[model samples]
Target chain A: SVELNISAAASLKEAMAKIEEEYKKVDSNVKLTVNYGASGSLQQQIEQGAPCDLFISAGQKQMKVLDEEKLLVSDTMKDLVKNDLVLISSADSSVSGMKDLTTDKVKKIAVGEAESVPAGKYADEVLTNLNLKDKLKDKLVFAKDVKEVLAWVQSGNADVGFVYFSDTVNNDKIKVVEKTDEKTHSPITYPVSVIKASKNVDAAKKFEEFLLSESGQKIFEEFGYKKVE
Target chain B: SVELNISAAASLKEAMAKIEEEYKKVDSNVKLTVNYGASGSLQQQIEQGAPCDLFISAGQKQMKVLDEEKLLVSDTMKDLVKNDLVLISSADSSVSGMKDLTTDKVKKIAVGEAESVPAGKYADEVLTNLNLKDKLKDKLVFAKDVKEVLAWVQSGNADVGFVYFSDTVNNDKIKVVEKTDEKTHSPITYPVSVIKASKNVDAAKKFEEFLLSESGQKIFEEFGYKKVE
Candidate 1:
């Protein structure tokens, strides 16, 4: 029996759980431990020598860092899923669309930290498109991550914020304002690969294969995540 | 040429800016100064004679205090937006939902100070109702505000926290574990009102009317908020 350690993105919870369940059936002796975190933080941990056998990232930038460091197993990098960025507000707000962001009625806006979180960077791109970036700068509250930005609006600390479409689907309190056009920012895609230093190479490879199997695809779709195809 | 000082909740950053822009278009010489802070803090300042024309709060509790003190224009109070409370976790956490929170694997959890913020009060109510309060109290880290709690979770200072639904919407880094039932606590409503000490009562009244108008309702709806009715 070999234990395979997996590091994955937070948004992949439902899909990953299904994948884990199906993977266990295929190899009873192969144990699995999963870790979830910001892509940047996870990349840093892997670089610092965390014993992860498989790495799944919410963005390509982090995976590229691992790839450049030769930390990934050869010929294993593949785009796994695609997600959309969305603007959201409390269900109680009168805000009907993203254009209303320019109105005087909206005051506090929450967004993720642009430095390490990809979602924040995408939000910055959306603001730039609206041409209100400079005007809204002072009103912008930078959260440490995407979930914090969501909390701000949910707590009424922020009037509105940006997050993933899948997240909006799970919560009834907040409604999606708009699905940001792909042209508004960098496209969102998750990339997965096996770590080069895995002690359980066969188990790691099997897990990656299982994520792309029919069962895995079904689970991913159920969570509102789309295949990268 | 009149000056209108606005003491508003921090969440109104966007709406105030847009108001300033529109006011400039009509009255080029009218000066609009906007002050932003937590609803409770701003209410205290107003109570001490901050000399503001308008006060927009993220919650009705603070507005009710002003009304009780006879600080608002007669019959000027109106609920603006409705928001929701949600539980959040770090992107890498193993906890999937509210049920998983009881597991021994969980460590620290962050929440806002109950006495100062509505979000904190609501979180306390939910926890107590769920029977998780006694067991989880020792593990809870109280933050100064909702934003700070999110920061604690994002920085890995805590494993999970409660925040607003709007704040988590567009974010990709955190997972929403659960949405608290509104039946467990007081209604979460953002109330807008005209202060009695205003020098520009006409302008303040106009702004209040604009907020409740159809256009205002549209903007609020887009941000995922609903009308008081």
Candidate 2:
């Protein structure tokens, strides 16, 4: 039996869980373990010599950095899925859109840390494009990842937050305020690559192929992630 | 004005026509000319030194042959769309499924040539899987492409035919008998690549990028083709 380690973006937790269960039924011989975190943090950890077989990032920037450093297997990188950046709040919150965040009633706005979180970077782009970043700088509450941001919003720790649309599925505690316009930020796509120093490259490649397979993609679609065109 | 010549599969005619119209609205500086034919014929044309900017084939085998001969521009290949294989006949025909093709009531079954037509190859696979190829061999009407097979069925020259699901959309002359089980044959996907011998490589790449863009893919979806997942 071979053990395969995967480092993936935190936003993919629910979908990854289902995919894992399905994958196990197909290949019982491979034991799988996944580390979910901010994509930037995962990339930095890999750069600092983390032991990983496969790496999936929420943004292309993180994946490109790893590729430039020659830390990825050649031609193994693939754009796996696309996501939508959205505004979300606690179910009963009165906040309706981006404009509401500037009012006195909406106090703290939760977002992931811009440097190490792809969701945060997209949030920053949206706010910057709307000219709200400077005005909301003092009121913005930055978290470690989009999941943390969602939790903060759900607990009313922050009035609103930015997260991937898939993060809101099956969570009755939150309400989606608005889906940000694509023109406002960079495209939200997840890229997957095999790490160069992996002890199980073949196993990692097999898993990557499974993720791109029709059945695998169908699972992702069921979880709210659209197939990248 | 730059001219971009495209050699695409015959099944792609209708979608490509709409795409060409939409693309002109985006980049008016480029003029487009398309040559649509059976994937095998197009592959041979390019092999015989035909002038082409981009190539879109209904099957991977044709693309692989071109790649082996070093005919494709490096790193520009992408799986563009997916399709379903379906059995069709004239609206008044009695055929209901693949099993019906083996009966004497079905005098002729139109199909593309197995050598150069991807749909024909898939049809051959389905017939062989159902153990009907031997019994139905003399009754098969081999055509140049799926479109020709469709024409034969529409004119009542053949009792039935196998063509893409997208081909049946908006055409009332034909009725779909059945969508073949995916397990019965290879997956139906179209691969697009830029030609290495293109006169305008940059222009060809731009057109390719537009085809993969969100709006471009939306157009394809509108025509019954699905985004490759």
Candidate 3:
């Protein structure tokens, strides 16, 4: 039996568990050790030599950072999934769409840490384009990752928040207000690859295919994730 | 290991598999067997005493038939989800909306078994209300399910067809001309439950909740099925 470590974005945690469950049943000989965190946080850990065999970033930038440092298995890294960004509000909030985000009713807006969180960065890209960033500066509340951003909106800590559409799929505490056009921001992609310098390169490669396989892609979709082209 | 069967509508395929994936993990010991077709087809099998653990119908009529037969766990029967009906045509068709369906330029039209398929039944209601039923009688082409209706429109076998809006989401070959007004037909609700005589009734009851749970509801949203209130 071989074991491999995989560091994935926290947003993937729930969906990943179901995939791993099915994968294990198919090949009981392989054991998976998984770690979940914000994409940038996971990237930093791998940069500092975290013993991960695979890295799946919520965005392409983190993967590019690792690729530029020649720390990934290079050719193995590719887009694995795509997600949409949406404005979320409390279940009872009157805000209905993106246009409502700029109104006085939305006193506080939550987003991921725009400088590091892929979710935050995408929201920033869109807010910047709408020319609403500067206007909502005081209203912006930054969290560590998408989940936290969702939590802020869910718990009524923020009047509105930007989160991945996938993040709000099953969440009743928060409802999506509007989906930002892809044109407004960089593409939301989940780029994945085998880490270079890992002791279990072969196992990592096997795991990657298992994750991208038809059955593997189904897991993400069941969790409201869109298939990556 | 336990095995349970879930009889579902063809329209629910894209969304149901998702609920199955997550619902499976919570009790991997129970293997779920799903059968998909027009809701009426599945209902007929259960009516004939087929060993079905659960039944999820595209329209309340089917479930009501089962409930009336006392074949389902009455208390467990509830509306699991909802979807909107649409008038569709090939991408190059001249039809723009419902009113266009009556134009002489439009010849053949496709509909699911109006007697059984909820989509066709709903479409039939609007057509009857518009008093176009007699005029279009010769133009009607009946199909086994919504997919067939979509196929007919997509292949130009019919000038226009009735389908679920969710069905047209990723299908580029056919475009939705318009979403039928709710008042046009009986509400389209997917009601679900465990069969009263099910051997796996306990597990069936357990899995039912997971399908209607928040995460379960999210999958339907991703596929364009509206949330059931």
Question: What TM-score describes the B chain of model 3?
Answer: 0.74
lDDT of 1 by residue, A38-91 (tens): 788899998989999999888888888898999999677878778888888998
Docking class of 1: incorrect
Ranking by TM-score: 3, 1, 2
What is the iRMS for every candidate structure? Answer: 29.7, 17.4, 12.3
Better of 1 and 2 by DockQ: 2
Docking quality (DockQ) for each candidate: 0.01, 0.02, 0.01
* Candidate 2 residue-wise lDDT, A1-229, digit = tens: 6799999988788899998887665555568999898888999999998999999898788888899999999688989899889999999999898778888878899999998777899999999999989999989989997779998998789989999889888999999999998889988999999999999886787678768867578889988798887
Q: Output the worst ten-in-a-row residue range by lDDT, candidate 2 chain B.
A: B21-30
lDDT of the candidates, in the order given: 0.77, 0.86, 0.82
Off by over 4 Å in 1: A26-29, B1-229
Residue-level lDDT tens digits of model 2 in B126-161: 888878789898998899987799899999999999
Q: Spell out the clash pairs found in candidate 2.
A: none
Docking outcome class, model 2: incorrect
Cα RMSD of all models vs. native, in order, equals: 30.3, 11.5, 19.6
lDDT of 1 at B31: 72
lDDT tens digits by residue: candidate 3, B129-159? 8788898998999999887888888889899
lDDT per residue as tens, model 1, B72-140: 996778786777788899788767777767887668878888878667888888888878899997788
Q: Per-prediction TM-score, please? A: 0.46, 0.45, 0.47
